[PDB]
Amino acid sequence: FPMMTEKGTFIINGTERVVVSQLVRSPGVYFDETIDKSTEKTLHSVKVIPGRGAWLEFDVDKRDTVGVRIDRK
Amino acid sequence: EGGPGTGKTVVALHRVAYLLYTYRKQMERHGVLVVGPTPAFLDHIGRVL
């Protein structure tokens, strides 16, 4: 198992390397609001985004009827 | 539902004003649909709206 030196590095096949840290978006439920284009109407949305699985999204449209999409279908 | 001689239309219009101010954030991009029996009455409304 490639181990890690006291300096914060790894040594791979002789060369010294560094595993940088990645910025990402956290899993969770993320709401929104996007002024509509056709009608200039507010309309909200949510989105549930885990590390693994399918994307489940709900919305409120201009017809004022809530809706859902599963696996972005 | 009232009757004649009691100003129900003006009252309804003031009511609509109260609502369109209070909840001017869900409305203000939807509108106010006002139906009526005749365009004479509709212009009257538009005139004291």
DSSP assignment letter at B10: H
C-alpha separations of B15 from A44, B21, B30 in Å: 28, 10, 17
Nearest-Å Rg of the Cα atoms of chain A is: 22
Distance separating alpha carbons of residues B13 and B20, to the nearest angstrom:
10
Distance separating alpha carbons of residues A3 and A17, to the nearest angstrom? 12
Q: Which residue of B has its CA nearest to A39?
A: B29
B24 chain-A contacts, CB cut-off 8 A: none
The β-bridge relationship of strands A28-29 and A32-33 is unpaired
This structure's resolution (Å) is 3.1
Which residues does residue B49 pair with via DSSP β-bridges, in sequence order? none
Residue in B with minimal Cα distance to A63 = B30
Chain B interface, Cβ < 8 Å to A: 29-30
CA atoms within 13 A on the CB side of A60: 13
Residues B42/B34, Cβ–Cβ less than 8 Å: yes
| A29 DSSP β-pair partners | A48
Method: cryo-EM
**How many alpha carbons lie under 13 Å from residue A73 in its C-beta half-sphere?**
3
Give the CA distances from residue B37 to residues A68, B9, B17, B20, B34, in Å, rounded to whole numbers and listed in that order. Answer: 40, 13, 22, 23, 10
